[PDB]
Design a protein around this ligand. Structure first.
Ligand SMILES: *Cc1ccc([N+](=O)[O-])c(O)c1
Ligand SMILES: *Cc1ccc([N+](=O)[O-])c(O)c1
Ligand SMILES: [Cl-]
Ligand SMILES: [Cl-]
Lengths: 230, 9, 230, 9
């Protein structure tokens, strides 16, 4: 529905939608901007990510509420299951949409480390969200798709980015959550978080005051998880 | 266990 | 889209949607329940009201953000106006939907004071929301439609309900907000809030502990407004 | 100026 709107107008309205906390609109505007076919700037990538993180975040929270009610019930009839299935299907649709944008054609055109790692982190995240609700023949393949995207992103970020780079840190944080919550590998999650934190600590001395704030913010999230896991 | 919040640009 | 679902299943899913904070779903389920054609119970009326209050509340908050940005701009292009108009149109559509449910045929079948006052209060509220964004030939008629619904509700509640009845109190609260914010009648708003509060105070002695809590809760909201207005 | 919140059943 966005094909008739200018790319720059879509970006401007995505920013307005964020201010209005209209994240479904924000996502539709950024989907339209992606489909114009041009690569995305750093700021534009953030807008895309923020929009869909909010949309799917609301869906995941609702799914967890309903899944919990459904587990307690296991006679109220089919309603809790039916409605959990409806939310689940809508969530899977959003994840498929984001993954489709990455595959057509954001990732293949992303040549710089900053953009390619960003998109591969996204790919890992949205397969992780699919894995959270998966139960059928493809649960293992979904998990391996998340793992593979995260791993490629990790390999690039370790080669091409300093240990304090916020995207590198956020990727490691989320990959560690993947290990702990999805892959049943809590020791791998703990080891990754610790090594990521320690390598960043040792590189903080190179940073400006503003970069220091950006990096230590995410380092605290790694620490919070380690405190919860150990 | 917290992932990146990532909900504010 | 709800014609094929049982009335009781729609009500059950509206309750689930509230727990999941999926208020657009909740509203659609309760719209489906209304369209089954049977009158609504006290609890069912509350579910209908809660659902649409949340939906339109989100739209009103977004409209105010965008309207404020638009007023500051008055060159960024037509985008802020266009997007404010889009939100405004969606808000007006929701208000029209609720008003259509009240007119077809909730109000005409509502014979008890509790149900009729409840629906007429709703009618006043959703015309008030239309009035908040109105600027054209019909702004005055929209305002008078809100006033007329509130007034009929007030006349019934004063005849048929005790001064501490929570619906009577909430109606008076919202009618006073109408006077202050929409009708440019701050003295009428203050007088209504004061008289409502004082008449309720004098009737609290008749109430149980639980009814006392229900009534004093809304009385505090009247007091909060009076503190802001005087 | 606050109307009825009315957002929780
Ligand atoms: C994935 C990611 C990494 C870092 C930050 N940050 O705030 O620096 C995000 O918002 C997201
Ligand atoms: C309109 C209205 C009146 C009273 C209450 N209450 O909480 O007692 C509402 O939620 C809504
Ligand atoms: Cl359903
Ligand atoms: Cl628009």
């Amino acid at each position: 529905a966005m094909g008739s709107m200018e790319r720059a107008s879509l970006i401007q309205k995505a920013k307005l939608a964020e201010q209005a906390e209209r994240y479904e609109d924000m996502a539709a505007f950024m989907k339209g901007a992606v489909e114009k076919g041009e690569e995305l700037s750093c700021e534009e990538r953030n807008l895309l990510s923020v929009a869909y993180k909010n949309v799917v975040g609301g869906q995941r929270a609702a799914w967890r509420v309903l899944s919990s009610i459904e587990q307690k019930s296991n006679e109220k009839g089919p309603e809790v299951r039916e409605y959990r299935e409806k939310v689940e299907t809508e969530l899977q649709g959003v994840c498929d949409t984001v993954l489709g944008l990455l595959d057509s054609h954001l990732i293949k055109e992303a040549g710089d480390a900053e953009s390619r790692v960003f998109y591969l982190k996204m790919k890992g995240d949205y397969y992780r969200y699919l894995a959270e609700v998966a139960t059928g023949d493809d649960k293992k393949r979904i998990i391996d798709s998340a793992r593979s995207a995260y791993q490629e992103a990790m390999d690039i970020s370790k080669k091409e980015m300093p240990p304090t780079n916020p995207i590198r840190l956020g990727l490691a944080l989320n990959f560690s959550v993947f290990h702990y919550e999805i892959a049943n590998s809590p020791e791998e999650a703990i080891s990754l978080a610790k090594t990521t934190f320690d390598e960043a600590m040792a590189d903080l001395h190179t940073l400006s005051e503003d970069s220091y704030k950006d990096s230590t913010l995410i380092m605290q999230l790694l620490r919070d998880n380690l405190t919860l896991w150990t | 266990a917290g992932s990146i919040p990532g909900r504010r640009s």
